[PDB]
């Protein structure tokens, strides 16, 4: 059954990106999905996205560009400390100058560099680059 | 889908977006309630009450016409079945299959389908016991089921 809604969203985005399509449809539009897409938006990795409101769970239409190389999800949501953030970034980022390991912390969902700037940690969600 | 089959059929009602519907319906919510309770007294399950309200009369759904759904209405007005309708129908089907097997021992297909139906019964009954709409230690037994249905 549908286990990871965020993983399904990220996989759909990746497949549309690789196919070249300028837009992608996502179901069923979780809040974690919205926050992940907001992080990608802030770092310029997608562009715009719309929340279609069917009363069940919502859908998302994301306008993509050519910039996203790979958006992914780390399942399970591993507990990550300040010590472990460098571990994860050097494990699953192309370089140390771009790309963000995204994690849900006590101060909401953010990327690893903002997590360091806020000196907080949490559970790893995924990554974008 | 089809927990006990290989079928992948997607076939379900397309619930409308409008929760306050349908603006050609000029009957009262209390009137729909009273039709519901008269049907429940007549001895219909919520599935049949809803199908008749939707078909013989113009009622898109009791949820959007009155303040709640049919099972909630019946539980509020005291017409609650002792066991839920789906569990009752599953038990009825299992009782039917067991009576069939008793005459037809060699029906291995019926034996397999009886195992499937009883697994469904036990899973649904465990859910009902967990939510506490069934009493604790409530158990489906083959001998007791025949009297429990009829």
């Amino acid at each position: 059954t549908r286990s990871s809604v965020l993983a399904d969203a990220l996989n759909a985005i990746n497949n549309a990106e690789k196919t070249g399509k300028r837009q992608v449809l996502i179901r069923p539009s979780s809040k974690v999905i919205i926050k992940f897409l907001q992080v990608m938006q802030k770092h310029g990795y997608i562009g715009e996205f719309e929340y279609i409101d069917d009363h069940r769970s919502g859908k998302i239409v994301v306008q993509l560009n050519g910039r996203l190389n790979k958006c992914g999800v780390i399942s399970p949501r591993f507990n990550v400390k300040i010590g472990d953030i460098e571990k994860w970034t050097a494990n699953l980022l192309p370089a140390r100058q771009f790309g963000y390991v995204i994690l849900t912390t006590s101060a909401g969902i953010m990327d690893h560099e903002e997590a360091r700037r806020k000196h907080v940690s949490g559970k790893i969600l995924g990554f974008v680059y | 889908g089809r927990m006990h089959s290989a079928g992948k059929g997607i076939s379900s009602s397309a619930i409308p977006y409008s929760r306050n519907a349908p603006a050609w319906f000029k009957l009262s919510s209390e009137s729909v309630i009273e039709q519901i309770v008269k049907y429940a007294r007549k001895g219909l399950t919520p599935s049949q009450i809803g199908v008749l309200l939707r078909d013989a009369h113009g009622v898109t759904q009791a949820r959007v016409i009155t303040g709640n759904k049919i099972m909630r209405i019946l539980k509020s007005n005291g017409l609650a079945p002792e066991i839920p309708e789906d569990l009752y129908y599953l038990i009825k089907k299992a009782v039917s299959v067991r009576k069939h097997l008793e005459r037809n021992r060699k029906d291995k297909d019926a034996k397999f389908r009886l195992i499937l139906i009883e697994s469904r019964i036990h899973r649904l009954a465990r859910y009902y016991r967990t939510v506490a709409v069934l009493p604790p230690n409530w158990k489906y037994e083959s001998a007791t089921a025949s009297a429990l249905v009829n």
Partner: protein, 144 residues
């Protein structure tokens, strides 16, 4: 899902699966069963002394035809009989009778080396004097 469980509480499943699948490794199974201390001829030891017993009608592997000797040796701590290969030219001078010879493995952790079938050990010392010392004539076996 790539097979293996991935849940955050599946650590017990992962550990037990790894414990079960360690046994497929040749060296882990030997180490955890103690096959060196129960059925290895040397009892898990690097070297072993022995008394050379007799001659046996054995034949070398490919390619040759050489039936002169290959030392059958009875170990002292185990009492087991193993065939050892005298590792140099001129094997005749050192196999006189009932000598005490020190044996090492052939280097393959319990397997035959080359064209010698069924021999897993070699001789390094003959009655306390080194075999290649005798081979190079730089030391003399005790003749009195």
């Amino acid at each position: 899902g790539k097979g293996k469980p991935r849940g955050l509480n599946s650590a017990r499943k992962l550990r037990v699966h790894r414990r079960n699948n360690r046994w497929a490794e040749n060296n882990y199974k030997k180490r955890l069963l103690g096959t060196a201390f129960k059925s290895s001829p040397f009892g898990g030891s690097s070297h072993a002394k022995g008394i050379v017993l007799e001659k046996l009608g054995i034949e070398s592997k490919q390619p040759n035809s050489a039936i002169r000797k290959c030392v059958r040796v009875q170990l002292i701590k185990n009492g087991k009989k193993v065939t050892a290969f005298v590792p140099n030219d001129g094997c005749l001078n050192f196999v006189d009778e009932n000598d005490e010879v020190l044996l090492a493995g052939f280097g393959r952790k319990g397997k035959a080396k080359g064209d010698i079938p069924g021999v897993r050990f070699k001789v390094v010392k003959v009655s306390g004097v080194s075999l290649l010392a005798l081979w190079k004539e730089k030391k003399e076996k005790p003749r009195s």
